[PDB]
Amino acid sequence: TLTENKRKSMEKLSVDGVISALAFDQRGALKRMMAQHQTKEPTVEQIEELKSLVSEELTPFASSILLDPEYGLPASRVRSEEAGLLLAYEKTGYDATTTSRLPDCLDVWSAKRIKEAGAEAVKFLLYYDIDGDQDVNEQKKAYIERIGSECRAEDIPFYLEILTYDEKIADNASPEFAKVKAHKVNEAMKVFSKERFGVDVLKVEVPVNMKFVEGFADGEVLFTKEEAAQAFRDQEASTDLPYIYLSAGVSAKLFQDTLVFAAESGAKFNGVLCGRATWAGSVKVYIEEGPQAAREWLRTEGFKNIDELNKVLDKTASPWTEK
Amino acid sequence: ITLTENKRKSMEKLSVDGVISALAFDQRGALKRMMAQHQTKEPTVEQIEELKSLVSEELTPFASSILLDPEYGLPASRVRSEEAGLLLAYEKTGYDATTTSRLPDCLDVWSAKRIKEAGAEAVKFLLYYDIDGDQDVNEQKKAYIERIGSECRAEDIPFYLEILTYDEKIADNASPEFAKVKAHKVNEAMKVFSKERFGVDVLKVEVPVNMKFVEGFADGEVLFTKEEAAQAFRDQEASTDLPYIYLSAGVSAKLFQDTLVFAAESGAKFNGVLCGRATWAGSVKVYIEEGPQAAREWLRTEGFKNIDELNKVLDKTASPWTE
Ligand SMILES: [Ca+2]
Ligand SMILES: [Ca+2]
Ligand SMILES: [Ca+2]
Ligand SMILES: [Ca+2]
Q: Which one of A108, A139, A149 has the shortest CB-CB distance to B112?
């Protein structure tokens, strides 16, 4: 039961109950990508400019765009008139030195300032290991409670992104992690669907690593199609909140086929916040060839990525205007 | 300006006839240091919890409410008089003496929601503030308070903000040097955090002058005339439209009482106190050296006389926040 203002904001972020959002709040990760292609340190100006190019060129094809408030405010002002705005609230990355990956809001931001910056939603990323240290998870749960309350007070939708991991498993791309991924994703969704966290939409991973699923796997096969399908149904049974998928930087084609698979399996997902799968290739072009060359990439390859995604969404996603 | 139904009810549970006569005992680090000067062994969790419980049980029948910390004070909160309301502290104790920023930090496993669930009628938070300090540091502080203010709005619980002033370049706030800038530090901080965006319901603040340097109150050097001190109280009264209450800062009970009289005479419309050390400080030595039963008797006699004597002064000095 959304308040009047939260519903209006949700409408601004969606079309006919489906969220077809573009994600570009990447910061540290984006800077590292740019650094691969030039000698000099990527500048604040370059980061701000690439974000503006992506926003201006691709938001006409998205129901909304997620940006960070650190570099993305200029980009937010050139988004399509029909597209809504989400702003990220978390500091970028995490400490690889430890296993706790504790959440931390941007130092000079608050839900109120995010709303004042023109956002229709506050987005926050939490790393979560359901099987992790209980005191660490207690601190994480308390942190999300605070943000949930902020968003209730400011009357702005709270989008919580959850990225799972295992304290003892170094690489989430490994077969070892793939075997526990469904558990990590689905149980974390169940926790954060509790009323006390104030979440309006969950941004989550697919509960399987498709690279290990029969029909998609090019190497070791860990799961039959029926086993993978059951993980999607388990995900659907973990929450009654709206939820949308992140791409995790797989290829545009794989993400598309994954959504088709999710839908056939019985996942009633409500759209996507898709970032890297759409715009990844623009970074090299921007750095090596400049702004105009990036625009031309975005109008051809970038458009192809988001256009094919939109066609898939049209035949796979379920409207949140039912829940 | 305007309290919700629930905030008003909670405010009433914290006061008597619009006057806040609250007993403060959320001291942690400071309390531990106090206990450590009367015994050889390190103060234990049990000692800290017990003393808090003794003070709560013996003195709350004479207080409109009690402020405790969630870390050690929850048992004590449960033995308070049925007539006394409860405030719980939300900040971590103390500050890093090595740096000058004194940045605020909430207790790691707490939230406004959990404070309310633990039975509190108010969330209390302590912020150190230097109005003339580093502007970026202060921006971070203001953002942090906005968040807490929003949390408290969402949970519909009164937000008590305590402000302790300091100067980044003055080591000792008891010095004549600090005394000369205190009115400025205090009154200007109250102006800042009285803005609607911070969501404060009550300000817990220092008196805007160091009375020990005021003519007629000073036993040593005299820095201010009574008229000058009086003008600082009037300036404080004009710095906020919110209810505000005084902390004792650990001055003697006699000086604090005289200060309240002088405040009212000068034109301050303060609405009560959150008074701690000036009331129970004396029980620490007795408890450590002599034990709980001994401490209990000090409380039923000297403790009661302290608080009863304070109450009689409040009866003639405080103004009701019904405002
Ligand atoms: Ca279109
Ligand atoms: Ca529920
Ligand atoms: Ca469901
Ligand atoms: Ca006297």
A: A149
The span from the CA of B315 to the CA of B229, in Å, is 22
Eight-class DSSP state of B219 = S
CA distances from B258 to B30, B88, B187, B217 (A): 25, 28, 21, 9
Of B48, B57, B42, residue with least CA distance to B28: B48
CA of A79 to the centre of ligand 1 (A): 14
Domain containing B22 — which CATH number? 3.20.20.70
- Taking the C-alpha atoms of residue B60 and residue B304, their distance in angstroms, rounded to an integer, is 10
Partner-chain contact A108 B151, CB within 8 Å: no
* Domain around B267: 1-323
- How many A from CA of B214 to the centre of ligand 4? 14
**Residue of chain B whose Cα is closest to the Cα of A155:** B154
Nearest-CA distance from B109 to chain A in Å? 5
How many whole angstroms from its chain centre is CA A228? 21
Phi and psi at residue B229, to the nearest 5°: -60, -45
Structural domains in chain B (count): 1
* CA neighbor of A298 nearest in space, from A282, A274, A313: A282
Q: How many whole angstroms separate alpha carbon B107 and alpha carbon B120? A: 15
User: A96 Cβ partners below 8 Å, 6+ apart?
Assistant: none
Q: Which residues of A touch B (CB under 8 A)?
A: 105, 107-113, 135, 138-139, 142-143, 145-146, 149-150, 152-154, 196, 198
- Which position has the token pair 């949970």? B155
Task: Of B147, B140, B80, B86, give the one whose Cα is nearest residue B115.
Answer: B86
Tokens 């008229």 sit on residue? B227
